[PDB]
Amino acid sequence: KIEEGKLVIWINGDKGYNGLAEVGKKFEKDTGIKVTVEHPDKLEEKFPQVAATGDGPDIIFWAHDRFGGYAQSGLLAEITPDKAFQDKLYPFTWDAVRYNGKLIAYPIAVEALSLIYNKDLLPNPPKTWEEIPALDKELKAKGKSALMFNLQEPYFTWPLIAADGGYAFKYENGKYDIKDVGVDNAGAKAGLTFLVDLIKNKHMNADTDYSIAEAAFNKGETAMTINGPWAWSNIDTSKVNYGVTVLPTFKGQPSKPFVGVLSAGINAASPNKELAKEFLENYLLTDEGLEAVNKDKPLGAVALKSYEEELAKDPRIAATMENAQKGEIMPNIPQMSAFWYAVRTAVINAASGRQTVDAALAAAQTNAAANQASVVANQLIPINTALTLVMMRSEVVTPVGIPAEDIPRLVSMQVNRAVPLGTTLMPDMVKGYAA
Ligand SMILES: OC[C@H]1O[C@H](O[C@H]2[C@H](O)[C@@H](O)[C@@H](O[C@H]3[C@H](O)[C@@H](O)[C@@H](O)O[C@@H]3CO)O[C@@H]2CO)[C@H](O)[C@@H](O)[C@@H]1O
C-alpha cells in the first residue's frame, strides 16, 4: 500500500482528518504526489505491529508519548529540520519529540484536557471536585447530571489521580527513573477512591465511555464533561452554549493532566522520506496548513509560533494552556504504553467493583514494569467449547489479543473456531465478546 511517489498518512479518528486531507489535496495539486489520509482503529497498536515488517503508513500522527517506543524499535526516520525551521516551533515541543539525542517526529500541537461546561446548566462551574456530588444531586432533581466523561481510558481520569500526588515515573537528575513508579501512593489512592465513590454514590456510571459522554453533553443532558480541543467542533455544531475552564481541584491541589504533543513521525521503511518532509514542513506546518486541520477539529495550542500567536487569543486555548501548565508533559520513553495499560486496567477494575482501589493500584504498580499480556490457548479448544480457566493462559505476544485480564470473564463463553494449543485468542474468536 506504501508506494514510491505517493503518501499514506495515519491519524486518529478523533482528529481533523478531513482538514488534513485538504492539505493533502493542495500538496497533490502542487507536486503531483497523491496523499491518502486514513484513520484506522487502534492505529497506535497497529503501527508498531505493521511497521515492524515494512508496512504501515509513510506518516503516523499520535501524541508524543508513544514515539520513544517506536524509535527504540527503529520504526522512525530521524527527521532533519534546518535551524530556521526548528526556530519556527516552540523549543519545548521539539523536546517532546527528542529521543536518545535525535528528533524523531515533527511536533504539531499541544493537547491538554479541560473542564467543558454548559453555561445554561452551570453558569458558574465548580472550582473543586468535592462540590460535584452536591451539584449532581441538585441537577438530578431537574432531570440532568453534573458530570460525564470517558472512564474507559486512563488519560481522562489521570488528572484526578495525579492531583494529590499520583505520578508515573519519577523524574530525577535529568532522567525518568522507571523503577520509581507512583500509581500506588497515597495521592493516587485518594484520587482514584474519590472517583470510585462518585460511581458508588450514583453520580457517575462505570460504563461511561467517550461517545456516551459526548452525546450527553452535546445534547444538553449533563452540565460538564472533560475533554480535549478536538471535541470543541461537535459542541459548536450542537449549539450548547459552552465554556472551557480550569479543571477542578482535589484536596486543594490542581488536577494535573498529562499533556500530549500531537506529532508526526516518518516511517523508517518509507521510500518517500523527502516527500514526507516537504509535506510536513512546507504544507502542514504553515499557517494555512494548520488552519485547515484546525477548522475541521481544533488542534489545541499549536507548536508553530506564528499561528499560535493568533490562537492564543481564544479563551478556550488559554484555558487549555492553564491546564497544561498545571499538569505535566508526558514522557516519551518506551515504558509509557505499559504504564498506560497498567493504569487502564486499575481504573476500570476499581470503578466497576471488580477490585478495591488499593488492590487495583498495587497491581498497577507491578504491571507498569511489565507489558500488556494476551489470552493464549493452554489446550486445543474445539469449536463451540465453553471456556474454562484451564483452557487459557497469559503471554506477552504480538499482535496483542484479548487482554489476559479478561480471562475470568471469558469463562463459559464459547469459541467460534477451533483454537489450537498456543494460539493467541483474538476478540473475533469468541462469541459475544463485543460485550
Ligand atoms: O489505555 C490503553 C492505551 O494506552 C496508551 O494510550 C494512551 C496514549 O498513548 C496517550 O497519548 C493518550 O491518548 C489520548 C491522546 O493523546 C489524545 O490525542 C486523544 O486522542 O485521546 C487519547 C485518549 O483516548 O492516553 C492514552 C491512554 O488513555 C497506549 O499507547 C495505547 O496503545 C493503549 O491502547
From Swiss-Prot:
Matches recorded under Pfam families: SBP_bac_1 (PF01547)
GO function terms (MF aspect): carbohydrate transmembrane transporter activity; maltose binding
Subcellular location: Periplasm
Keyword flag Signal: yes
ATP-binding keyword on record: no
Domain of life: Bacteria
Keywords: Periplasm, Signal, Sugar transport, Transport
Predominant place of localization: periplasm
Listed GO biological process terms: maltodextrin transmembrane transport; maltose transport
Gene3D superfamilies: Periplasmic binding protein-like II
GO CC terms, sorted: ATP-binding cassette (ABC) transporter complex, substrate-binding subunit-containing; outer membrane-bounded periplasmic space
Functional note: Part of the ABC transporter complex MalEFGK involved in maltose/maltodextrin import. Binds maltose and higher maltodextrins.
Subunit structure, as described in the record: The complex is composed of two ATP-binding proteins (MalK), two transmembrane proteins (MalG and MalF) and a solute-binding protein (MalE).
Homology family: Belongs to the bacterial solute-binding protein 1 family.
Protein name: Maltose/maltodextrin-binding periplasmic protein
Species for this entry: Escherichia coli O157:H7
Gene designation: malE
